From a paper:
pmcCK2 is a ubiquitous and constitutively active protein kinase. It has a heterotetrameric quaternary structure, consisting of two catalytic subunits (α or α′) and two regulatory subunits (β).2 The α/α′ subunits carry out the phosphorylation of target proteins and peptide substrates, whereas the β subunits confer stability to the enzyme, control substrate specificity, and govern cellular localisation of the holoenzyme complex. CK2 acts as an anti-apoptotic protein and is seen to be overexpressed in a wide variety of cancerous tumours. One such alternative method is via the inhibition of the protein–protein interaction (PPI) between the α and β subunits of CK2; the PPI interface is not as well conserved among other kinases as the ATP active site hence its inhibition is considered a more selective approach.
Author numbering:
A (entry chain C): 432 to 438
B (entry chain B): 2 to 329
Write the structure that this text describes.
C-alpha cells in the first residue's frame, strides 16, 4: 503492498 | 461594530519572539527517511484524510505507527510535520520517528513511536479515581508544553490520547489540526469534534487561543468522572451550545457574548431557551460516585467556563487540589 510499503 | 479582541493570558508572544523558520511551516523543507525500513502489520484507523497502520521497523525489529497523509491542502502536511518536529521530546508528546514517502505516488507518511493503546470504550470503565487524576496530569504536562511552544492542539479527545495502561504510558497524538498561536489571529472555528467544541467555536468567535484545549480537556474529564459519553450531547453545532447552556446556564452565556461583543447567529433564537446554572453534584450517580470528589467538581467547574480567558491555564490546572495525590 500500500502506498509503496510492503505488508 | 465587530467583536472585541482577545489574546492568551499565558505564552502570548512565543511565536512573535521566535525566528520565522519556527512557525512559517509552508517554507519547511521536509527531511525524508527510507520507506523500505517499515513494513505494514495492520490497519488502526481509516479517515477520509489519513490511513494509519501498526508497522515494524525491519532495521531494529521495533513496532512503529505509520500515518499516510492525504489532506485536502498539501500545506497541512508541512503543518503537522513542523508542529511534530517543534514539539518532539516534550513530556507525553507523541514522537515523530521518521517521515517517508512512496517513491512512485509520492504519498507521504509519518512514522511515530508505537503506543499499545486500549480503545477508551474498553479501558476507561476500568480506571480508578487515581488513574483518571494520573492520566489527566500527563495530558496537562503535554498541553502546558505545547502551549509553551506556541501551539494549540485543537483536537483534544479520547481518540487522540493513546494510553498503554500496563506501563502507565500516555501520549497526546494527532497534531493534524494543531496550529501556531499568533496573538490577534482569527482562526477557523470549524475545528474539533462537536462534543469537544468550545463555546468560542460555537458562537463563531475566531480570536481564540490555547484555552480552547482546556475546554476540550474539561469535556473529556466530565465524560470520564461522570461515565456520561459524551458529556455535552449536541445533535448539531447549534444544539451543542444549547447542551452547554443547559448546564452552565444562559445568564453567563449572555455575559460572555457581551464581554466580547459577539453577535449570536439567529439560528440560536428559537432553540437557546432559558436555563439555570446547574450544580455539578447533580451529575453524580451510583455508577460514577467512586470517581467523583469535591476537588474533581471544583476542577471541572474551573475548566468548563464560557469565557476562554477565565478557564485555568494548563499550568494553573496542574496546581489544582485534584492533582495533590499525583507525583509532581
Ligand atoms: N502512535 C500511535 N500508537 C497507537 N495508535 C495510534 C498511534 N497514532 C495513531 N494511532 C491510532 O490511529 C488513529 C488515528 O491516528 P490520528 O493521528 O488521530 O489520525 P487522524 O488525524 O486521521 O485522526 C488514532 O485514533 C489511534 O487509534
Ligand atoms: Mg485523530
Ligand atoms: Mg487528526
Ligand atoms: Na529551523
Amino acid at each position: 503492498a500500500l502506498y509503496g510499503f510492503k505488508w | 461594530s465587530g467583536p472585541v479582541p482577545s489574546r492568551a493570558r499565558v505564552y502570548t508572544d512565543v511565536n512573535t519572539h521566535r525566528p520565522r523558520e519556527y512557525w512559517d511551516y509552508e517554507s519547511h523543507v521536509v527531511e525524508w527517511g527510507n520507506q523500505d525500513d517499515y513494513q505494514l502489520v495492520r490497519k488502526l484507523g481509516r479517515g477520509k484524510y489519513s490511513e494509519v497502520f501498526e508497522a515494524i521497523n525491519i532495521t531494529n525489529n521495533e513496532k512503529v505507527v505509520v500515518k499516510i497523509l492525504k489532506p485536502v491542502k498539501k500545506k497541512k502536511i508541512k503543518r503537522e510535520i513542523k508542529i511534530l518536529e517543534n514539539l518532539r521530546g516534550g513530556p507525553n508528546i507523541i514522537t515523530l520517528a521518521d517521515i517517508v514517502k512512496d517513491p512512485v505516488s509520492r504519498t507521504p507518511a509519518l512514522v511515530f513511536e508505537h503506543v499499545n493503546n486500549t480503545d477508551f470504550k474498553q479501558l476507561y470503565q476500568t480506571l480508578t479515581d487515581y488513574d483518571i487524576r494520573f492520566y489527566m496530569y500527563e495530558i496537562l504536562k503535554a498541553l502546558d508544553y505545547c502551549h509553551s511552544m506556541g501551539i494549540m492542539h485543537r483536537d483534544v479527545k479520547p481518540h487522540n490520547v493513546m494510553i498503554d495502561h500496563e506501563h502507565r504510558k500516555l501520549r497526546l497524538i494527532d497534531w493534524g489540526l494543531a496550529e501556531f498561536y499568533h496573538p490577534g489571529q482569527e482562526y477557523n472555528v470549524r475545528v474539533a469534534s462537536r462534543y469537544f467544541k468550545g463555546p468560542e467555536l460555537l458562537v463563531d468567535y475566531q480570536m481564540y487561543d490555547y484555552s480552547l484545549d482546556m475546554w476540550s480537556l474539561g469535556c473529556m474529564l466530565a465524560s470520564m468522572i461522570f461515565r456520561k459519553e459524551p458529556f455535552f450531547h449536541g445533535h448539531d453545532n447549534y444544539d451543542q451550545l444549547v447542551r452547554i447552556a443547559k448546564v452552565l446556564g444562559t445568564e453567563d452565556l449572555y455575559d460572555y457574548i457581551d464581554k466580547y461583543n459577539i453577535e449570536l447567529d439567529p439560528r440560536f433564537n428559537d432553540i437557546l431557551g432559558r436555563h439555570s446554572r446547574k450544580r455539578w453534584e447533580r451529575f453524580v450517580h451510583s455508577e460514577n460516585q467512586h470517581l467523583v470528589s469535591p476537588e474533581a467538581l471544583d476542577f471541572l467547574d474551573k475548566l468548563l467556563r464560557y469565557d476562554h480567558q477565565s478557564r485555568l491555564t494548563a499550568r494553573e490546572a496542574m496546581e489544582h487540589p485534584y492533582f495533590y495525590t499525583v507525583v509532581k
